[PDB]
């Protein structure tokens, strides 16, 4: 319900949408402290009261539009006036939205320059998102006096108090799971350094018994790394809780736990919808102090996360008016090339799309804070010291690898960019510069965030990552418009790519808070043998330029103790093992009979497919050349001159004649009376005997032949 | 083949013995990793390499796919005739110094008018004109005031009218018929010749008007042509007040002001029936020619004075001023120029460079760095010999028994080198370093 | 419109060429095996190799250089003595 009303008055322009405004902020600011019954002092009856002011406040705008519509229809005359008074009024016509919806009514045909004046778009006087609110806020009334209603109260009421508890409770059940994680993590270690001794155990037996052929010793890695010989291979190798419901409850627990990133997602959903200065803040803050916040952000984050977004609302509502000039038709015509104009760069326009964004901001925003209300949960060095203490030091952490998961989003961002090419230059539709050295920064930024991940250095990903938002949010916002001269909000791809990297700055922010994860970690790809690792791994593999930049990027970036060509070479070695054990895998979950043939329909289906790609391929060429190497066409010669004239001196007598409608006594195409005329004389030109003749009325009529009438 | 065969197993047993003595003389210990300095300058040059190697193509195409500039046109002329007949009325006037009262660049105050009156050339309800604004005003407002041209031409004929008594009765007999004849309007923008391209780029572009079959217009036509006074010839839609003169083509058509100018001013033109080609020439304007005798027949002179369609006082015109030296309003045309060519247009882009960019980097990847970088599987069991000290002892061997004018003994110690190439377990027992 | 771009014989030249190049270099290479790569490309259980390296990876990992470079000289000489590779490629038992 307070979203229907918080949109219709978004929505609208006029006194009327800031009231809506004032009521549904008044509102959703106490949250559900006002639906109880506390202190018996007549609060439900207060809420009732309040709710039943907003009933009667949205009949009184919907009774002053209709009453409206016929002030400006016909009672429109009264506002053509003179300056001064008759100013005043055109500015109060357009800040009550005094206008014509009824499109079946005549124009006003002597009052078209007033209209010029004072512009009232259409589609404001109208009341539709009024209406859908009403709906919704009737119905709520009717809510509001069931039976359901009153154990939502009991549900509230003397519950909602037990959220002491409750993060008690929460903060147990964390600290046992940190326990958990922390046994599974000293486990994998015993675990790890029993492998590694019995491994150098192994070793140490077999030099040992081998110690009769074990004739040099090494000195240094390269006798050491060539020391390989028989005596190390001398041994043996040795409705209810059932399936319909998991779906709908896995959500709900993950979107209920998850509240925060979906908020912080929604800002840079509105951000990026509504890219200018008024809106980078949210983002910029988010990002920067309360979603790499190591414990939950604060009361303080989202008090003003609140109150700056409810002023953004209020300051962009304000700006949809039209007594300011930009938010005028000849003001926007005259200055919608630029993206960097003033309108555009604080974020503000005429928006004809009905935009929705910020209101799910605000309410993701109240939902997480009223989910932190229920948990309980919402209540030196200086607070920044502190901020950096508990953030490099957390007292409460979990341990996950999602390197493969940021690595997943700016492949996509790059690949999203690099296709969408085409929007970030610009008739002019050519390669810039600005997009090759693009292209530089974002593999250079790919090959830093591989380097910090194998290094495992926090601070250094945590002054990256902010550098990385920092960059994005500037470039995107001021120097792409200006270098391509297209605003962010017709720049889609550019909005799309923004998004993605906010998916990975929120993924990477996440991965700071818990720390680099220091467990073994491996190839990210050949963890399983299966179908999608070997197609995914062989795929890797044929890209050129992909394996060695990894292999090279780990190499210098890990610690290891054999050189760069070595580690290639045992890189090479572990892809091609990975792949004949996948191999094998494969074959063993689908295994083929011993003396029993390949079906012929197996045959038949893996036959056809390669003969005919490769025939197609043979043939290709030839294809594309004869589909390309077409026979033009040229219309019939439009103008003829002729000029005679003696040697070096004016034309002595000169013509030109032309005009090829079919019409014309002078430039005639032939008739074919003619044609056919003239072709008869031409064979008939032989004579008996001399077949030079002969030839030459051969000759003479192939030639004529060759070329129709037209 | 033999020969060969020796020559590159000797290439690769010294390539061997000299990798092993040059390990030796810089040797590396046991245990202790590689330092990370050197690490560090051996991982940025190879990665920096390889990385300007990946995006150097498009570098060098980036540095080579430059946008090109034209100067203004120099010269530009009109030539006003009926179909297949001298030029009934031609024009000619250049002059790029900025200085010219013919061919003088757009003032900025004269473009700030236009283009406010473009700007308010929208009704209040009807958002069709709301997007015809938007159009028309996106096409004027890429174009600056360096790249638009005010040209003039004079109203009163360049050469006296060069027609023959015998070709103007022809003229004359043939606009007495049913045989309908075009009225030409021949415009001509010449470029500056640029060196870099070396063309002298002419732009240039024929507008045909029918002549109405009626025999009342053609009788006074004809009478007009004959020399009678007091007829004037009507020329409808024929002329455009707004040209785009483009790097390559044809005087392109501003069609967004053109349907602005059809359907925006308040005398709005019935434009419901018509030709499709003829209704993109609605908002042409209409010369109107009257031609001076004075004294005899021999001076015909044809003079133009072009009237704008709709509202001649419509403030999206540009005000004509009238001549210096007769009193009569100049013809105006105003020119939107291009100024950007493709140098290579990607060679004529279909994909290919893309594509041949794909392809030699596939080429290069998997024929240089899959293999000179990543030894094979099969390869490391010939590589990565431990001590190549008795191989080379063979093959030196067998080139000294050679150079000694010896052949018995080189036969077989090549097949003891063969051998040795081909049975793994001997060249395991044959590279065992020193003991 | 394009007179196969002042043709020489070049057309047909380049396309000889390229389907030249094109065979030799994809499908002969990834499409049939050489007799060399049999060796490695057809070993009936490669667990054991597998294993091998992980082991390594394991030790490079666990911040241990000591047993890395004798584990990829066993991994070498496993690669270089194609007897050793047969003993240690048997499936199971």
């Given at each position: 319900?307070?979203?229907?009303?918080?949109?219709?008055?978004?929505?609208?322009?006029?006194?009327?949408?800031?009231?809506?405004?004032?009521?549904?902020?008044?509102?959703?600011?106490?949250?559900?402290?006002?639906?109880?019954?506390?202190?018996?002092?007549?609060?439900?009856?207060?809420?009732?009261?309040?709710?039943?002011?907003?009933?009667?406040?949205?009949?009184?705008?919907?009774?002053?539009?209709?009453?409206?519509?016929?002030?400006?229809?016909?009672?429109?005359?009264?506002?053509?006036?003179?300056?001064?008074?008759?100013?005043?009024?055109?500015?109060?016509?357009?800040?009550?939205?005094?206008?014509?919806?009824?499109?079946?009514?005549?124009?006003?045909?002597?009052?078209?320059?007033?209209?010029?004046?004072?512009?009232?778009?259409?589609?404001?006087?109208?009341?539709?998102?009024?209406?859908?609110?009403?709906?919704?806020?009737?119905?709520?009334?009717?809510?509001?006096?069931?039976?359901?209603?009153?154990?939502?109260?009991?549900?509230?009421?003397?519950?909602?108090?037990?959220?002491?508890?409750?993060?008690?409770?929460?903060?147990?059940?964390?600290?046992?799971?940190?326990?958990?994680?922390?046994?599974?993590?000293?486990?994998?270690?015993?675990?790890?350094?029993?492998?590694?001794?019995?491994?150098?155990?192994?070793?140490?037996?077999?030099?040992?018994?081998?110690?009769?052929?074990?004739?040099?010793?090494?000195?240094?890695?390269?006798?050491?790394?060539?020391?390989?010989?028989?005596?190390?291979?001398?041994?043996?190798?040795?409705?209810?809780?059932?399936?319909?419901?998991?779906?709908?409850?896995?959500?709900?627990?993950?979107?209920?736990?998850?509240?925060?990133?979906?908020?912080?997602?929604?800002?840079?959903?509105?951000?990026?919808?509504?890219?200018?200065?008024?809106?980078?803040?949210?983002?910029?803050?988010?990002?920067?102090?309360?979603?790499?916040?190591?414990?939950?952000?604060?009361?303080?984050?989202?008090?003003?996360?609140?109150?700056?977004?409810?002023?953004?609302?209020?300051?962009?509502?304000?700006?949809?008016?039209?007594?300011?000039?930009?938010?005028?038709?000849?003001?926007?015509?005259?200055?919608?090339?630029?993206?960097?104009?003033?309108?555009?760069?604080?974020?503000?326009?005429?928006?004809?799309?009905?935009?929705?964004?910020?209101?799910?901001?605000?309410?993701?925003?109240?939902?997480?804070?009223?989910?932190?209300?229920?948990?309980?949960?919402?209540?030196?060095?200086?607070?920044?010291?502190?901020?950096?203490?508990?953030?490099?030091?957390?007292?409460?952490?979990?341990?996950?690898?999602?390197?493969?998961?940021?690595?997943?989003?700016?492949?996509?961002?790059?690949?999203?960019?690099?296709?969408?090419?085409?929007?970030?230059?610009?008739?002019?539709?050519?390669?810039?510069?600005?997009?090759?050295?693009?292209?530089?920064?974002?593999?250079?930024?790919?090959?830093?965030?591989?380097?910090?991940?194998?290094?495992?250095?926090?601070?250094?990903?945590?002054?990256?990552?902010?550098?990385?938002?920092?960059?994005?949010?500037?470039?995107?916002?001021?120097?792409?418009?200006?270098?391509?001269?297209?605003?962010?909000?017709?720049?889609?791809?550019?909005?799309?790519?923004?998004?993605?990297?906010?998916?990975?700055?929120?993924?990477?922010?996440?991965?700071?808070?818990?720390?680099?994860?220091?467990?073994?970690?491996?190839?990210?790809?050949?963890?399983?043998?299966?179908?999608?690792?070997?197609?995914?791994?062989?795929?890797?593999?044929?890209?050129?330029?992909?394996?060695?930049?990894?292999?090279?990027?780990?190499?210098?970036?890990?610690?290891?103790?054999?050189?760069?060509?070595?580690?290639?070479?045992?890189?090479?070695?572990?892809?091609?093992?990975?792949?004949?054990?996948?191999?094998?895998?494969?074959?063993?979950?689908?295994?083929?009979?011993?003396?029993?043939?390949?079906?012929?329909?197996?045959?038949?289906?893996?036959?056809?497919?390669?003969?005919?790609?490769?025939?197609?391929?043979?043939?290709?060429?030839?294809?594309?050349?004869?589909?390309?190497?077409?026979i033009?066409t040229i219309s019939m010669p439009e103008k003829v001159t002729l000029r005679i004239?003696?040697?070096?001196?004016?034309?002595?007598y000169?013509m030109?004649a032309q005009g090829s409608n079919h019409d014309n006594a002078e430039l005639g195409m032939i008739k074919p009376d003619q044609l056919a005329s003239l072709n008869q004389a031409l064979t008939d030109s032989y004579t008996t005997r001399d077949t030079n003749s002969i030839l030459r009325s051969r000759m003479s009529v192939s030639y004529l032949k060759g070329y129709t009438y037209e | 083949?033999?020969?060969?065969?020796?020559?590159?197993?000797?290439?690769?047993?010294?390539?061997?013995?000299?990798?092993?003595?040059?390990?030796?003389?810089?040797?590396?210990?046991?245990?202790?990793?590689?330092?990370?300095?050197?690490?560090?300058?051996?991982?940025?040059?190879?990665?920096?390499?390889?990385?300007?190697?990946?995006?150097?193509?498009?570098?060098?195409?980036?540095?080579?796919?430059?946008?090109?500039?034209?100067?203004?046109?120099?010269?530009?002329?009109?030539?006003?005739?009926?179909?297949?007949?001298?030029?009934?009325?031609?024009?000619?006037?250049?002059?790029?110094?900025?200085?010219?009262?013919?061919?003088?660049?757009?003032?900025?105050?004269?473009?700030?008018?236009?283009?406010?009156?473009?700007?308010?050339?929208?009704?209040?309800?009807?958002?069709?004109?709301?997007?015809?604004?938007?159009?028309?005003?996106?096409?004027?407002?890429?174009?600056?005031?360096?790249?638009?041209?005010?040209?003039?031409?004079?109203?009163?004929?360049?050469?006296?009218?060069?027609?023959?008594?015998?070709?103007?009765?022809?003229?004359?007999?043939?606009?007495?018929?049913?045989t309908?004849?075009?009225?030409?309007?021949?415009?001509?923008?010449?470029?500056?010749?640029?060196?870099?391209?070396?063309?002298?780029?002419?732009?240039?572009?024929?507008?045909?008007?029918?002549?109405?079959?009626?025999?009342?217009?053609?009788?006074?036509?004809?009478?007009?042509?004959?020399?009678?006074?007091?007829?004037?010839?009507?020329?409808?839609?024929?002329?455009?007040?707004?040209?785009?003169?483009?790097?390559?083509?044809?005087?392109?058509?501003?069609?967004?002001?053109?349907?602005?100018?059809?359907?925006?001013?308040?005398?709005?033109?019935?434009?419901?029936?018509?030709?499709?080609?003829?209704?993109?020439?609605?908002?042409?304007?209409?010369?109107?020619?009257?031609?001076?005798?004075?004294?005899?027949?021999?001076?015909?002179?044809?003079?133009?004075?072009?009237?704008?369609?709709?509202?001649?006082?419509?403030?999206?015109?540009?005000?004509?001023?009238?001549?210096?030296?007769?009193?009569?309003?100049?013809?105006?045309?105003?020119?939107?120029?291009?100024?950007?060519?493709?140098?290579?247009?990607?060679?004529?882009?279909?994909?290919?460079?893309?594509?041949?960019?794909?392809?030699?980097?596939?080429?290069?990847?998997?024929?240089?760095?899959?293999?000179?970088?990543?030894?094979?599987?099969?390869?490391?069991?010939?590589?990565?010999?431990?001590?190549?000290?008795?191989?080379?002892?063979?093959?030196?061997?067998?080139?000294?028994?050679?150079?000694?004018?010896?052949?018995?003994?080189?036969?077989?110690?090549?097949?003891?080198?063969?051998?040795?190439?081909?049975?793994?377990?001997?060249?395991?027992?044959?590279?065992?370093?020193?003991?």
């Amino acid at each position: 319900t307070l979203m229907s009303t918080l949109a219709a008055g978004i929505a609208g322009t006029s006194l009327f949408a800031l009231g809506y405004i004032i009521f549904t902020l008044t509102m959703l600011w106490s949250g559900n402290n006002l639906y109880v019954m506390n202190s018996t002092l007549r609060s439900f009856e207060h809420t009732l009261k309040r709710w039943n002011a907003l009933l009667g406040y949205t009949l009184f705008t919907i009774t002053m539009k209709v009453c409206l519509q016929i002030f400006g229809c016909v009672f429109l005359s009264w506002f053509d006036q003179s300056g001064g008074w008759g100013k005043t009024l055109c500015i109060v016509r357009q800040l009550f939205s005094i206008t014509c919806v009824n499109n079946e009514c005549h124009v006003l045909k002597e009052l078209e320059d007033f209209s010029k004046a004072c512009a009232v778009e259409t589609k404001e006087g109208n009341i539709g998102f009024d209406v859908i609110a009403l709906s919704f806020l009737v119905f709520q009334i009717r809510i509001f006096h069931s039976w359901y209603f009153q154990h939502c109260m009991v549900e509230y009421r003397s519950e909602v108090i037990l959220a002491n508890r409750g993060a008690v409770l929460k903060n147990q059940l964390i600290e046992k799971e940190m326990k958990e994680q922390n046994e599974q993590q000293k486990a994998k270690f015993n675990d790890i350094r029993r492998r590694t001794e019995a491994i150098r155990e192994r070793y140490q037996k077999q030099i040992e018994r081998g110690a009769a052929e074990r004739d040099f010793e090494p000195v240094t890695y390269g006798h050491a790394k060539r020391a390989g010989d028989y005596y190390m291979f001398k041994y043996d190798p040795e409705q209810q809780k059932s399936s319909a419901t998991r779906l709908l409850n896995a959500v709900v627990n993950c979107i209920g736990a998850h509240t925060d990133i979906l908020c912080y997602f929604f800002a840079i959903m509105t951000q990026v919808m509504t890219g200018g200065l008024i809106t980078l803040p949210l983002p910029l803050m988010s990002l920067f102090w309360g979603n790499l916040s190591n414990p939950r952000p604060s009361k303080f984050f989202w008090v003003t996360m609140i109150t700056y977004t409810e002023c953004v609302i209020v300051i962009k509502f304000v700006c949809q008016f039209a007594f300011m000039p930009y938010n005028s038709i000849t003001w926007r015509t005259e200055h919608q090339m630029d993206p960097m104009s003033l309108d555009k760069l604080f974020g503000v326009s005429q928006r004809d799309s009905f935009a929705l964004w910020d209101i799910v901001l605000l309410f993701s925003l109240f939902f997480h804070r009223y989910m932190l209300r229920k948990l309980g949960l919402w209540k030196q060095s200086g607070p920044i010291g502190r901020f950096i203490h508990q953030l490099f030091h957390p007292k409460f952490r979990y341990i996950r690898d999602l390197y493969p998961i940021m690595f997943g989003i700016d492949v996509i961002c790059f690949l999203i960019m690099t296709f969408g090419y085409s929007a970030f230059g610009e008739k002019a539709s050519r390669i810039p510069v600005t997009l090759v050295v693009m292209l530089v920064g974002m593999t250079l930024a790919i090959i830093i965030d591989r380097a910090l991940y194998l290094r495992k250095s926090v601070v250094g990903k945590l002054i990256y990552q902010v550098l990385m938002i920092a960059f994005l949010h500037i470039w995107v916002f001021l120097v792409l418009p200006n270098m391509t001269r297209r605003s962010a909000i017709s720049n889609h791809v550019a909005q799309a790519l923004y998004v993605i990297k906010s998916c990975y700055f929120l993924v990477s922010a996440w991965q700071i808070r818990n720390g680099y994860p220091e467990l073994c970690i491996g190839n990210l790809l050949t963890h399983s043998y299966g179908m999608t690792n070997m197609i995914a791994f062989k795929v890797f593999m044929n890209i050129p330029f992909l394996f060695e930049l990894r292999t090279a990027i780990d190499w210098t970036w890990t610690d290891t103790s054999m050189p760069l060509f070595d580690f290639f070479n045992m890189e090479n070695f572990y892809a091609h093992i990975f792949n004949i054990k996948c191999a094998r895998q494969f074959e063993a979950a689908y295994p083929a009979p011993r003396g029993i043939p390949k079906g012929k329909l197996v045959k038949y289906m893996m036959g056809f497919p390669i003969i005919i790609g490769v025939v197609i391929f043979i043939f290709s060429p030839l294809l594309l050349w004869s589909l390309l190497n077409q026979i033009g066409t040229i219309s019939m010669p439009e103008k003829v001159t002729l000029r005679i004239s003696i040697e070096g001196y004016p034309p002595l007598y000169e013509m030109e004649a032309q005009g090829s409608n079919h019409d014309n006594a002078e430039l005639g195409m032939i008739k074919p009376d003619q044609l056919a005329s003239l072709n008869q004389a031409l064979t008939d030109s032989y004579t008996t005997r001399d077949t030079n003749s002969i030839l030459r009325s051969r000759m003479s009529v192939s030639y004529l032949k060759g070329y129709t009438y037209e | 083949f033999d020969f060969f065969n020796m020559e590159n197993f000797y290439a690769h047993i010294f390539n061997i013995k000299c990798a092993r003595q040059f390990e030796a003389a810089y040797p590396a210990p046991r245990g202790i990793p590689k330092g990370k300095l050197v690490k560090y300058m051996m991982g940025f040059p190879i990665i920096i390499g390889v990385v300007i190697f990946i995006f150097s193509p498009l570098l060098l195409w980036s540095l080579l796919n430059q946008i090109g500039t034209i100067s203004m046109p120099e010269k530009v002329t009109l030539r006003i005739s009926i179909e297949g007949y001298p030029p009934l009325y031609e024009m000619e006037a250049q002059g790029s110094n900025h200085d010219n009262a013919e061919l003088g660049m757009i003032k900025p105050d004269q473009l700030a008018s236009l283009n406010q009156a473009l700007t308010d050339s929208y009704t209040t309800r009807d958002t069709n004109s709301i997007l015809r604004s938007r159009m028309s005003v996106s096409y004027l407002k890429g174009y600056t005031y360096e790249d638009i041209l005010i040209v003039r031409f004079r109203p009163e004929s360049e050469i006296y009218w060069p027609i023959s008594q015998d070709s103007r009765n022809a003229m004359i007999d043939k606009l007495s018929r049913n045989t309908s004849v075009n009225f030409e309007v021949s415009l001509e923008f010449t470029r500056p010749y640029d060196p870099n391209e070396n063309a002298a780029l002419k732009h240039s572009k024929s507008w045909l008007v029918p002549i109405s079959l009626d025999m009342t217009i053609r009788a006074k036509i004809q009478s007009a042509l004959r020399g009678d006074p007091g007829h004037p010839i009507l020329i409808p839609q024929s002329i455009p007040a707004f040209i785009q003169v483009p790097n390559q083509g044809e005087l392109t058509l501003p069609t967004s002001i053109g349907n602005t100018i059809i359907n925006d001013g308040n005398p709005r033109i019935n434009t419901t029936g018509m030709e499709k080609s003829d209704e993109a020439r609605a908002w042409f304007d209409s010369l109107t020619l009257n031609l001076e005798q004075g004294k005899s027949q021999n001076e015909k002179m044809w003079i133009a004075t072009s009237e704008h369609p709709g509202d001649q006082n419509a403030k999206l015109w540009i005000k004509t001023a009238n001549t210096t030296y007769s009193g009569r309003p100049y013809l105006q045309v105003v020119g939107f120029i291009d100024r950007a060519f493709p140098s290579f247009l990607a060679k004529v882009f279909k994909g290919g460079v893309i594509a041949v960019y794909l392809s030699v980097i596939l080429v290069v990847g998997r024929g240089l760095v899959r293999g000179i970088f990543t030894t094979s599987p099969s390869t490391v069991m010939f590589t990565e010999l431990p001590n190549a000290d008795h191989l080379l002892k063979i093959c030196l061997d067998i080139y000294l028994v050679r150079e000694a004018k010896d052949f018995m003994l080189e036969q077989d110690l090549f097949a003891k080198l063969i051998f040795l190439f081909r049975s793994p377990a001997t060249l395991i027992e044959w590279t065992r370093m020193s003991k």
